[PDB]
Design brief:
- The structure is cut from a larger assembly and holds three copies of chain A.
- Chain A has one helix at residues 76-83; strands at 13-16, 20-31, 40-43, 56-65, 86-109, 112-117, 123-127, 152-154, 157-161, 164-165, 168-169, 184-186, 192-197, 204-205, 207-209, 226-232, 241-247, 261-262, 265-266, 270-272, 290-293, 296-299, 316-318, 324-326, 335-336, 340-342, 360-363, 380-383, 385-386, 392-393, 406-408, 414-416, 425-427, 434-438, 460-476, 519-521.
- Chain A is mostly beta strands.
- The first copy, chain A, is 2% helix and 34% strand.
- The interface between A and B is large, with 127 and 112 residues.
- Strand 24 of chain A pairs antiparallel with strand 16 of chain B, so a sheet runs across the interface.
- Chains A, B, C: It is found in: Virion.
- Chains A, B, C: This is Capsid protein.
- Chains A, B, C: Keywords: Capsid protein, T=1 icosahedral capsid protein, Virion.
- Chains A, B, C: Its main location: virion.
- Chains A, B, C: Cytosine binds at residues 415, 417.
């Protein structure tokens, strides 16, 4: 629409209707030139990694837009308003806009850098609406819109992995040229818009359960069902066998017949947040729950949605069963427990097994008396990994303000309960990837013709504004609970700083991860 | 329509529309008299089998029509055209026709055999459209239409098994008279037609995945999720414990948090195609994965859809985890590896565990430090059988040109992912069984009346033509892959014979089993 | 239409309209069972042939209908009527009918043979209207309808050749199941009809030329064009060079400038019908014109349409340049000149080079005088093979009453003047092959089921009537010639037999081959 006319406005807001909330977020992005406009083949051959870390793939000159975290859309106040008042929520629709494009030319001479406007340069943008590209969103990568609307963010580079045999490729390894797509070319007066509708996904549960699964009975009335209570005489003067049956009573609630089972489990190793109680070894790889796929092992991390610990055991967490967010000023490698924030799944103890303990015990032999004068005592074994049994009920992992929103469900023949293990909404057709790059501008060509492809380019980057608007459907509480509920609250106390704010240096920080499960409902 | 008028034509063709393919196949069949028109009770009492091989059932005088293999409908060229170009396929509808019936009377006198036409004899045909009979199709039996349209095939005899207690029956053992059905009686001028519509079944996947499930991340960007990396000090000068956390990075891809899990597994024993590397014992029954049902064991064979082997390990196959087709000139018992064709499931390594290896490891204890001066090292155990966990994704078994198409899903209260384990489409209402028999023609009765049932019959058989037409819906590839795909191809080389042809003796042979997964798509 | 009702009538006639002639021919055919209903792979490996005679192909159980000779449609009287009165002719349309099918069962016991009617057996017939099969018609094979309408003929077996590397096949070698086509099944009351329209092909020339190509000038008038006549002095007293030019005059007609050239040539070896004048060696392969294709040589036979001999040289014929028909009582191998009939192409001397002589001479050097004191005499060389030059005109080979009518033009990128070298009409879509076989009738099957394909069949053959009706368009003479024309005539003389009749034993014989070129027209 011209050089001197803005192609969009700043739309950062949150509107709460009766059963919907619409969150709008605008951010300022910077996109550099990646790979010098080259597609590069990347692998682990030069890295010299272990067999488990081998890979083969490609690095493209494109960047992508990521808004797959909840704090890209919700302020902490909006998140608190959602989680303190709603029993569930899900996304309905989204709008994406890209506007106010500025391409900047950079020249460095004698150490000093000049930046100018390039009014005739373009950025190519396209949305992969048919999911023809590898989906790298949903792997919890950096590069999302920053939580604070004042922050300017760099656009992450696009790259993918394909089938590999060690550090080598195979015949079925794919290569994707992203220039083989129709792109919209944007000069400084152009904008880009894109709408998307979410499929009907189940509401995420912003509630805990007020009852436990093994405590669903009337505590005053007996049962009409009997169970075997004693196989020996109760008197004890003699030690004779018997078959004595008792009625299901509130005195013994552990032996009452029940209708349902706790969800599946895959036991993790128990690590104490107090380092002195941990074994003096590494055991982060040798003692960890991992799966085998094509000969190379992968840590589960976090796997099945299970309770982090029991009651009065907050000092323990599963070794790779929890989502760990880093605070600002946390290093990339071997940072400290003080620099990370470990989440807790304490609210799903009502239906899910504890992550660090067995599902239960199982009979492993036939008990018998002496006759065949070889008496066989009954024997049980611990069940550490339990798959889905009929009658099982469970809760999924919680979502966090700092955590992912959705994940693409793999296009496979079968999948069981396709809810992402990091938490969020599993979508068969997720929001498509928006891919953006600067169109290469060649430098001065030679006077004589050369068929060698161009390698000298004018160095430039681009900047602009991006808006994402998501409509979310809410599921209101309808509780008849009498006593007040647990709510997420700010701490009232004199503190050097306010939580979820900037410091005197201007650095936005999030003190803690906030989940969703504060309200309760009966099981 | 008369003795001298043909009641049908030869319809053997294949028509390719945009998204459909219609395959028509005509064959010549011969139906003998089975059991001398008698229903016989069969069991294992005279056989003297083991407890695992005991059975009780009935043999009927009826034969049945079977077209439950893919090569009854597709030529090898048509199969190649389908699998090289389509991402998926499924059956939509079918037509069955039975025409040109000829009943032949046979008399053997003094060793010489006379065959004449019996113009007034009938064949009874009926379709079991309400599934009131035991469904013996879908057990991979011989007797289908031959792959080569020039071959004349004998119709297999119908028989079923019922509930047995050893070699004995029980009260709930059923008996079915097939004459207790309405049948159409066909003389030499009559024909039989029957139409059937398939239920909406999912497309079979004619693709492999270009990505592995543990390689779905961006290989250039780090994660915002942390994991416990060290529980000991990294320096090594001292051996103190710690809690050091690292960020998910492309350097270590095995320890990155992920969203999904590989499919379920049930480990098989690993057998080498090179016999010298196998243990010197039988162990085909003692060392095999089998299940217990009512006290008798049954080999899984092939069970869960898992990868046959790892990379660079084509010499190994699971002992009973692969579909094995026999070549022509293969014996019924104890034939050779040279006479059988072992299939491979190498394309589903991207999502499925390898059949001969564990699903993974699981924590089995609590690690702790000395204090309770009994230090407990962390301990893991191998997980050999893993049921369905939420977040699991998998591919089903491949279908082959020589393999089955469908299977009836058992009418049970529950079933999990009712896809047949041999491969194909599981149908609640599959194509019904077409049952055919020659109507008995009694020989000369006595002059005086006898109430004893007739046992002397005129010996006869019947011949005719059978047509099956199936419409299949196709799911076209929509790939954006740049490099060329892997295709199924004929080998270009001077060879004594052409593959999938006849030899100088007229014997049609299929050199190899052909799967479907040649094209690829991103995971 | 029933057992006792005939499905067609005998239609053998010839109707002459003004510019059309419609020829109808009915014949009685017998079709046996070929290969025992088997497809067999045939090659030269067991034959042990030379590299030039290697082949690979298939033998099918089908027979085919052939009416690709002119005497299948024209009586000798009709042929004489056509060739004595028409300047040209071509085929317009055809109708094919198959009627009065009788399947006969054969049993041989103790040496005596019983034949019975099989009223319920079928013959499968189909027309290959889309040319999806190898076209084996147009190779001048036996098995056509006999010339005499009273003769009963056996139907020839269908077989084809594919790509071969010696006696072996290659990857691109094709195999065709003919049961993979839709066939019409005919019982004894059914018939088969099929119509076909010929493409617009040029008229075959039933004329000779009254002028020669080098004699197209006015013999009374000079030319206005000059030619170099002498390069030496005419007087002869001295021997000096000169440049003397003469005018084109009727005195020297060989040196007159002309407008056209004779057709292309490919010289053949000259063989005398009088054996004493031939060289005492074999030289039928070593001294013959042959072409090289994929390393193996093939005799041209007959190749370019050229004159058989010159004037007054009827004793000579090109070694493989003439169509040779065998008389009745001619052996298959090494029969006598008395038993064969050699054709003559004497009528096309007006425009075509003689087959056994060079096209002409060509200059091969530069003539010069002594100076460089090395005088160079002019030198010419004989031109034995001459391709098409602009200005060339030629006639095609003649057609004969005993010769082929048409040939399929190969589906290639290029072809030059696609007129078959044996003579006739080259058609891109020729009349399709009609393929017929007896439907196999299995013998008595075993009491127990066997998946081995049937090998025991009821021995039977079929007989019936076939009608072919061709409409031909005529091109009438419009000559202004005064003197009477040369006509084909019967010889008036007392002879023991009449030509083109039966003898006292009932054997129809054709005394001589009759061409078409009797009328004349100016060049």
């Amino acid at each position: 629409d011209g050089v001197g006319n803005a192609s969009g406005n700043w739309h950062c807001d949150s509107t709460w209707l009766g059963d919907r909330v619409i969150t709008t977020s605008t951010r300022t992005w910077a996109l550099p030139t990646y790979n010098n406009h080259l597609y590069k083949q990347i692998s682990s051959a030069s890295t010299g990694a272990s067999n488990d870390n081998h890979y083969f793939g490609y690095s493209t000159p494109w960047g992508y837009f990521d808004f797959n975290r909840f704090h890209c859309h919700f302020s902490p106040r909006d998140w608190q308003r959602l989680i303190n008042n709603n029993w569930g929520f899900r996304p309905k629709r989204l709008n994406f806009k890209l506007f106010n494009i500025q391409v900047k030319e950079v020249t460095t001479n004698d150490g000093v850098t000049t930046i100018a406007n390039n009014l005739t340069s373009t950025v190519q943008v396209f949305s992969d609406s048919e999911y023809q590209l590898p989906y790298v969103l949903g792997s919890a990568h950096q590069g999302c819109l920053p939580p604070f609307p004042a922050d300017v963010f760099m656009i992450p580079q696009y790259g993918y992995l394909t089938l590999n045999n060690g550090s080598q490729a195979v015949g079925r390894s794919s290569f994707y040229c992203l220039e083989y797509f129709p792109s919209q070319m944007l000069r400084t007066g152009n904008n880009f818009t894109f709408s998307y509708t979410f499929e009907e996904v189940p509401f995420h549960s912003s509630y805990a359960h007020s009852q436990s699964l093994d405590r669903l009975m009337n505590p005053l009335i007996d049962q009409y069902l009997y169970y075997l209570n004693r196989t020996q005489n109760q008197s004890g003067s003699a030690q004779n066998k018997d078959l004595l049956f008792s009625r299901g009573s509130p005195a013994g609630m552990s032996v009452q017949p029940k209708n349902w089972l706790p969800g599946p489990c895959y036991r993790q190793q128990r690590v104490s947040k107090t380092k002195t109680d941990n074994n003096n070894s590494n055991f982060t790889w040798t003692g960890a729950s991992k799966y085998n796929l094509n000969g190379r092992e992968s840590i589960i991390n976090p796997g099945t949605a299970m309770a982090s610990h029991k009651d009065d055991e907050d000092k323990f967490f599963p070794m790779s069963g929890v989502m760990i967010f880093g605070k600002e000023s946390a290093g990339a490698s071997n940072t400290a427990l003080d620099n990370v924030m470990i989440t807790d799944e304490e609210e799903i103890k009502a239906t899910n097994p504890v992550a660090t303990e067995r599902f239960g015990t199982v009979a492993v032999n036939f008990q018998s008396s002496s006759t065949v004068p070889f008496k066989t005592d009954p024997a049980t074994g611990d069940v550490h990994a339990m798959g889905a049994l009929p009658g099982m009920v469970w809760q999924d992992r919680d979502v966090y303000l700092q955590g992912p929103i959705w994940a693409k469900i793999p296009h496979t023949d079968g999948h069981f309960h396709p809810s992402p293990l990091m938490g969020g909404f599993g979508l068969k057709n997720p929001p498509p990837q928006i891919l953006i790059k600067n169109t290469p501008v060649p430098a001065n060509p030679p006077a004589e013709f050369s068929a060698t492809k161009f390698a000298s380019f004018i160095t430039q980057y681009s900047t602009g504004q991006v808006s994402v608007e998501i409509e979310w459907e809410l599921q209101k509480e309808n509780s008849k609970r009498w006593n007040p509920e647990v709510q997420y609250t700010s701490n009232y106390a004199k503190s050097a700083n306010v939580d979820f704010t900037v410091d005197n240096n201007g650095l936005y920080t999030e003190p803690r991860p906030i989940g969703t499960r504060y309200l309760t409902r009966p099981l």
